RNA sequence: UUAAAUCCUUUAACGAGGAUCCAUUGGAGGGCAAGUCUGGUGCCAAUUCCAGCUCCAAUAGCGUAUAUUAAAGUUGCUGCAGUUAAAAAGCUCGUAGUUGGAUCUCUCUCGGCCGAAGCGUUUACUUUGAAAAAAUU
RNA sequence: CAAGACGGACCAGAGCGAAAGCAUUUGCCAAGAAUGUUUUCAUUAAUCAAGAACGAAAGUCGGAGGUUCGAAGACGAUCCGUCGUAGUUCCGACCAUAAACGAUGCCGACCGGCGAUGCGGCGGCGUUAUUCCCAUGACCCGCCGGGCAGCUUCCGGGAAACCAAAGUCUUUGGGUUCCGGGGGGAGUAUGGUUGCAAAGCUGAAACUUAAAGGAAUUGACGGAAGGGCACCACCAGG
């Protein structure tokens, strides 16, 4: 079930059993990696890179073709951000909700949802501190939240 | 649902400690204030001085007028009332006598016939009531 | 209907009866 | 009733089931190749694409994203691929 | 959430057996589940099974035969010293002949008779009669 | 016998018909063993109190009181419950503690094939061995 | 003409929200479930002591406004009526309690049928947008997913009412939280703590009692009600 919602939905992606590249795909691994590099230089999150490569160029799975996932490809070249993209999106949402709250003080629903968001932030920050992605002195603070975005 | 981990020993025994405290017998035996409020003082028998003789009325559906003696315990000064087996055995007991008094029988509970009498007289003048009833012994005064 | 005491006795007795029947059936296989 | 081979389901039942709940899960989407009406070029487009797909040479909108399957522009030709 | 997939497998098999089904599907597969099923196979309780291999944790289709009365897990995995083993079967088995404590020992996953022959103890997993 | 004795053991003599050389203690006419009984004493035939007989159980022992244990799965680890019987928190975010999906099939130096040395990631687990007062069981 | 209040009918078998709750149009703001997905991360999760957010109504402290209703109160009758104080309305602080109900923790698995409904998606002839000039909306058929709610059932369970969970339980172990231990004394005394207050949270013992309680099937029963008959009953009469 959902981590803060009462929903329990099944919807997700289902990978096929064939891990082999299809015969009709003529793109080599380095061409796909060059597309990844120019897309990241356009300023795109790895999720957006995967969606664009799936839709327009027909690359179904980047790891099945190149052998590495998008974040590792961007990391080896060095075009990867300091904080991860899910934590970035959560902190951006928390900043937006806090701005809405400072303009609108009666919205107790917005207060409850902000508490939900920053609890999700605390769980993800604990995970990233445990596996050494974030430095151990990193801490999410309310005023420092907009400074990260 | 009860926890069943391999490291839940502390939680299980702490819960059992508290829920032990929620039992009347455990709390009576472990709180100390029952033996600090029992007239016998934890004992099975106690001696006393016969203050007087009183009469207790029995239950409503079967009317009777039973005869008890009000006695004052030696060791702690408490006043209790004690049952006598029949009206004949009341003639062996006098005011200001030494009496040995036991419980009525069911580990501390009252009589199912005579309401609120708790104790029965076993000995008077250091001789038993059973011997005095049967003519086996006489009592001194 | 009937007290739970003899229902428990009947259930455990019939269970031991299946235990004995399967024991004799499995002993017959040797 | 109570007598069927779970190891060998028929194509109609395994097609009918949810994509995760089959014997071995498999997607329902596909990659299909599209010819623009104003040109001849082949574009490989995901069936459930979330991005609007422009022609690399003509810059004509091939498909518009919807809730499920993508909505092709009228005039475009498409073929199932692989 | 889902913890102890062996419990889920054994409950699924027991519920399938009580309805008089012949064939059951088990997800997910595991090494411990396959070893337990092989142990029940060698004693002639659950017939035949086949492992469907997708690129996830797999699934198992088991051919039930009818002899099995109750298969069950024991959670948590209590340590079973070789003396204590005797006590354990008197707690779980309805007789001293049939039924099976399954132990994982350093000599493998096996039943209590074979663990007594190999003279070793281990963690208790279940029982089936 | 023993320090000297007593007791026990061994032996003379005496020692049993009501073999009076006389077994008690409790309970029974609602339920586990055991009653279609009698006689006194009062209320308006039922009915308070008292003495008995008959039967039953254990027996040189048998009642009683109190505590405690077992019955008891009324403390529940094994092994209880929580709609209507005692009982689930107003509701959800909300650290610690408890629990956590699938997966991986021994050698190097110096002395006589061996001994020393690094252990091999650490444990938990299991088996073996030493060692650990008697008395108690 | 004005002031305050409130959004009926449509309005449910509906929907949304963590719960309390939520119904005039329009615009803005920031959230959200489900669905779709050959995106990404790759165990990041489940459950709660501590601590914190929200919490109907009534209530307390400052303001504003006071139409209706209305505790108290003044009158008139004898549970009602006239007038109407505090309040009910808004803003800012508190209080944190309800039959706050499914008198029913949360997360996970397995275990019958049916045809309805809300949202999303997929496939498909047809009718419609005055035969619509292709799509699109509205209907129609079927399937899939997460829902709300039914009917049915020797799955099993229960003391029974009944429950697709209150099942998979003496054949007794998926994970974890709160909590009961006969009836009263008694939510009392005492101490602590929160609150401006009203009160809230925690919470005994002495003693007393043989019960307390839950579920269901039932004869008779002075009577009571619906009808019918009769000039030894009635109306009008002799």
Q: Give the Å distances, CA to CA, from E33 to B24, E63, E125.
A: 48, 15, 10
Q: Which two tokens stand for residue E60?
A: 């198992």
Instruction: Tell whether E2 lies on the interface with A, counting CB pairs under 8 A.
Output: no
d(CA E10, CA E22): 15
Kindly determine whether residue C15 and residue E97, on different chains, have CB atoms separated by under 8 Å: no
Instruction: Tell whether E96 lies on the interface with C, counting CB pairs under 8 A.
Output: no
Round to a whole number and report the distance in Å from the CA of A28 to the C1' of G112: 54
Q: Which two tokens stand for residue A139?
A: 């801490």
Rg (CA), chain E: 14
Q: Which of residues 15-74 of E touch C (CB under 8 A)?
A: none
Q: Cβ neighbours of residue E92 under 8 Å, at least 6 residues apart?
A: E72, E74, E99, E101, E127
Tell me the three state secondary structure of residue E115: helix
* Dihedral sign, Cα of residue A74, residue A75, residue A79, residue A80: positive
How many other CB atoms are there within 10 angstroms of residue E18's CB atom?
11
E-chain CB neighbours of B4 within 8 Å are 75-76
Q: Which chains touch B (3 or more CB pairs under 8 A)?
A: E
Do A64 and A105 reside in the same domain of the chain?
no
* Dihedral sign, Cα of residue A122, residue A128, residue A129, residue A135: negative
Chain E CA closest to residue B4: E76
Q: For residues E101 and E112, is the Cβ–Cβ distance under 8 A? A: yes
Instruction: Tell whether A14 lies on the interface with D, counting CB pairs under 8 A.
Output: yes
H helical segments located in E1-129: 5-18, 31-42, 84-92, 112-118
User: Parallel, antiparallel, or unpaired for β B119-124 and B79-83?
Assistant: parallel
Using C1' positions and the CA of A64, the closest nucleotide is: G38
Q: Which of A81, A147, A89 is nearest to A117 (CA)?
A: A89
Tell me the three state secondary structure of residue E14: helix
A-chain CB neighbours of E59 within 8 Å are none
Give the closest residue to G158 (Cα–C1′). C4
Instruction: Tell whether A42 lies on the interface with D, counting CB pairs under 8 A.
Output: no
d(CA D3, CA A36): 52
Task: Give the side-chain half-sphere CA count within 13 A for E123.
Answer: 11
A-chain CB neighbours of D50 within 8 Å are 51, 55
Using C1' positions and the CA of E12, the closest nucleotide is: G110
Q: Which two tokens stand for residue D18?
A: 């949810």
Using C1' positions and the CA of B108, the closest nucleotide is: F66
User: What phi and psi values does residue E54 have, to the nearest 5 degrees?
Assistant: -95, 180
Chain A CA closest to residue D33: A58
* A1 occurs within a structural domain: no
Q: Which of E23, E29, E35 is nearest to E59 (CA)?
A: E29
Kindly determine whether residue E22 and residue D3, on different chains, have CB atoms separated by under 8 Å: yes
End-to-end alpha carbon distance in chain B: 69
A-chain CB neighbours of D19 within 8 Å are 14
Rg (CA), chain B: 22
Q: Which of B87, B107, B86, B98 is nearest to B44 (CA)?
A: B107
The total number of structural domains in chain D stands at 1
Instruction: Tell whether A58 lies on the interface with D, counting CB pairs under 8 A.
Output: yes
Which H or E element spans position E128?
strand E122-128
Do A94 and A147 reside in the same domain of the chain?
yes
Q: Which of A24, B122, E32 is nearest to D33 (CA)?
A: A24
Q: For residues A40 and A74, is the Cβ–Cβ distance under 8 A? A: yes
- Work out the minimum CA distance from E94 to partner chain C, whole angstroms: 8
Query: Which of C15, C16, C23 has the CB atom closest to E97's CB atom?
Result: C23
Instruction: Tell whether E75 lies on the interface with B, counting CB pairs under 8 A.
Output: yes
Cα B6–chain centre separation: 48
Three-class secondary structure assignment of chain C: CCCHHHHHHHHHHHHHHHHHHHHHHHHHCC
d(CA B124, CA B71): 12
* A67 occurs within a structural domain: yes
**Domain boundary pick from A80, A96, A124:** A80
Q: What burial class does residue D73 get, using C-beta atoms within 10 Å of its C-beta: 0-12 exposed, 13-18 middle, 19+ buried?
A: middle
Residue A65's domain comprises 26-80
* A3 occurs within a structural domain: no
d(CA B5, CA A21): 46
Three-class secondary structure assignment of chain A: CCCCCCCCCCCCCCCCCCCCCCCCCCCCHHHHHHHHHHHHHCCCCHHHHHHHHHHCCCCCCHHHHHCCCHHHHHHHHCCCCCCCHHHHHHHHHHHHHHHHHHHCCCCHHHHHHHHHHHHHHHHHHHHHHHCCCCCCCCCCCCCCCHHHC
Q: Which of B30, B26, B35, B21 is nearest to B108 (CA)?
A: B35
What secondary structure does DSSP assign to B62-120, as a single string? S--EEEEEEEEETTT--EEEEE-SSSSGGGG--TT-EEEEEE-SSSS---SSSTT--EE
* A13 occurs within a structural domain: no
D-chain CB neighbours of E21 within 8 Å are 2
- Work out the minimum CA distance from C17 to partner chain E, whole angstroms: 11
Residue D31's domain comprises 1-82
Solved with = cryo-EM
Which H or E element spans position D11?
helix D11-16
Resolution in A: 3.2
Which of E7, E76, E79 to mutate: most B Cβ within 10 Å? Answer: E76
Domain ranges of chain E: 1-68, 69-129
The total number of structural domains in chain A stands at 2
Q: Which two tokens stand for residue E120?
A: 């070793």
Say whether the peptide bond before residue E28 is cis (omega within 30 degrees of 0).
yes
d(CA A138, CA B104): 76
Q: Cβ neighbours of residue B116 under 8 Å, at least 6 residues apart?
A: B56, B110
- Position of tokens 């709390």? B27
Measured to protein CB atoms, the chain F nucleotides within 7 Å are: 26, 48-50, 64-69, 74-78, 80-82, 88, 92-95, 97-104, 125-128
Which residue(s) pair with E72 in the sheet? E127
Task: Give the side-chain half-sphere CA count within 13 A for E27.
Answer: 14
The CA dihedral of E88, E89, E91, E96, to the nearest 10 degrees, is: -160
How many other CB atoms are there within 10 angstroms of residue E7's CB atom?
16
Query: Which of A55, A57, A60 has the CB atom closest to D50's CB atom?
Result: A55
- Expressed in percent and rounded to 5, the helix, strand and coil fractions of chain D are 5, 25, 65
Q: For residues A52 and A44, is the Cβ–Cβ distance under 8 A? A: yes
**Residue count (chain A):** 149
Q: Cβ neighbours of residue D39 under 8 Å, at least 6 residues apart?
A: D55, D57, D58, D60
E-chain CB neighbours of A18 within 8 Å are none
Kindly determine whether residue D45 and residue A55, on different chains, have CB atoms separated by under 8 Å: yes
Q: For residues B68 and B80, is the Cβ–Cβ distance under 8 A? A: no
Chain E CA closest to residue D3: E22
Which H or E element spans position B28?
helix B24-30
Q: Which two tokens stand for residue A137?
A: 């002195």
Which H or E element spans position D46?
strand D42-46
Do A111 and A137 reside in the same domain of the chain?
yes
H helical segments located in E19-110: 31-42, 84-92
């Amino acid at each position: 079930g959902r981590m803060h919602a009462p929903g329990k939905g099944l919807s997700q992606s289902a990978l096929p059993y064939r891990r082999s590249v299809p015969t009709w795909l003529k793109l080599t691994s380095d061409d796909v990696k060059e597309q990844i590099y120019k897309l990241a230089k356009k300023g795109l999150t790895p999720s957006q890179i995967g969606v664009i490569l799936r839709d327009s160029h027909g690359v179904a799975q980047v790891r099945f073709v190149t052998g590495n996932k998008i974040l590792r490809i961007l990391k080896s070249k060095g075009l990867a951000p300091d904080l991860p993209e899910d934590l970035y999106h959560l902190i951006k949402k928390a900043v937006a909700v806090r701005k809405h709250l400072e303009r609108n003080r009666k919205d107790k629903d917005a207060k409850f949802r902000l508490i939900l968001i920053e609890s999700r932030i605390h769980r993800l920050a604990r995970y990233y501190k445990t596996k050494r992605v974030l430095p151990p002195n990193w801490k999410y603070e309310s005023s420092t939240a907009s400074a990260l975005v | 649902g009860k926890c069943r981990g391999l490291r839940t020993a502390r939680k299980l025994r702490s819960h059992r400690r508290d829920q032990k405290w929620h039992d009347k017998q455990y709390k009576k035996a472990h709180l100390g204030t029952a033996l600090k409020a029992n007239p016998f003082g934890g004992a099975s028998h106690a001696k006393g001085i016969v203050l007087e003789k009183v009469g207790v009325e029995a239950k409503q559906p079967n009317s009777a007028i039973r005869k008890c003696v009000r006695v004052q315990l030696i060791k702690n000064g408490k006043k209790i009332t004690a049952f006598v087996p029949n009206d004949g055995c009341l003639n062996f007991i006098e005011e200001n006598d030494e009496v040995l008094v036991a419980g009525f029988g069911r580990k501390g509970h009252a009589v199912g016939d005579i309401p609120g009498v708790r104790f029965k007289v076993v000995k008077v003048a250091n001789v038993s009531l059973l011997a005095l009833y049967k003519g086996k012994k006489e009592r001194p005064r | 209907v009937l007290p739970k005491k003899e229902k428990m006795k009947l259930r455990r007795e019939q269970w031991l009866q299946k235990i004995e029947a399967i024991k004799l059936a499995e002993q017959k296989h040797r | 009733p109570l007598a069927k081979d779970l190891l060998h389901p028929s194509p109609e039942e395994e097609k009918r089931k949810h994509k995760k709940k089959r014997l071995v899960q498999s997607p329902n989407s596909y990659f299909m190749d599209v010819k623009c009406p104003g040109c001849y070029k082949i574009t490989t487009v995901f069936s459930h694409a979330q991005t609007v797909v422009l022609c690399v040479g003509c810059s004509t909108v091939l498909c518009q994203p919807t809730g499920g399957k993508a909505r092709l522009t009228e005039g475009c030709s498409f073929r199932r691929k692989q | 959430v889902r913890m102890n997939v062996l419990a889920d497998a054994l409950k699924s098999i027991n519920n399938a057996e009580k309805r008089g089904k012949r064939q059951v599907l088990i997800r997910p597969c595991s090494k411990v589940i396959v070893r337990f099923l092989t142990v029940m196979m060698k004693h002639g309780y659950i017939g035949e099974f086949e492992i469907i291999d997708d690129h996830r944790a797999g699934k198992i289709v088991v051919n039930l035969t009818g002899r099995l009365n109750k298969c069950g897990v024991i959670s948590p995995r209590f340590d079973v010293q070789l003396k204590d083993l005797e006590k354990w079967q008197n707690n779980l088995l309805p007789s001293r002949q049939f039924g099976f404590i399954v132990l994982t020992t350093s000599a493998g996953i096996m039943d209590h008779e074979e663990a007594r022959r190999k003279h070793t103890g281990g963690k208790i997993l279940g029982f089936f009669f």
